[PDB]
Amino acid sequence: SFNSSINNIHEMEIQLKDALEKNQQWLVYDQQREVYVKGLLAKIFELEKKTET
Amino acid sequence: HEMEIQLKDALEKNQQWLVYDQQREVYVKGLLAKIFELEKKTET
């Protein structure tokens, strides 16, 4: 019937709003990784300094 | 259909994040391995 065709358009809309805000989730996620990563680099810099003395 | 198109672009970028993410995780693990080695050093 035509139920399948209507459902698919809902389903396709579902996917796009799910995909769009998934990439938006990626942005936030990655921003936090950068914070963690610059912290690790600061920690390495102090450990290298400590292993030199 | 225009919504059909941007669904594909959304999924494209979504794939680009995915591969980028794999690279970044390897990088994070590398820094942690380096820290581990450094902390092991001194110590002694």
Binding site: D18, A19, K22, Q25, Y29, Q32 | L11, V28
Partner: peptide, 13 residues
Amino acid sequence: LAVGPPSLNYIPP
């Protein structure tokens, strides 16, 4: 399907 990050907040390995 679309894939999102393993969490909403970054969790280190």
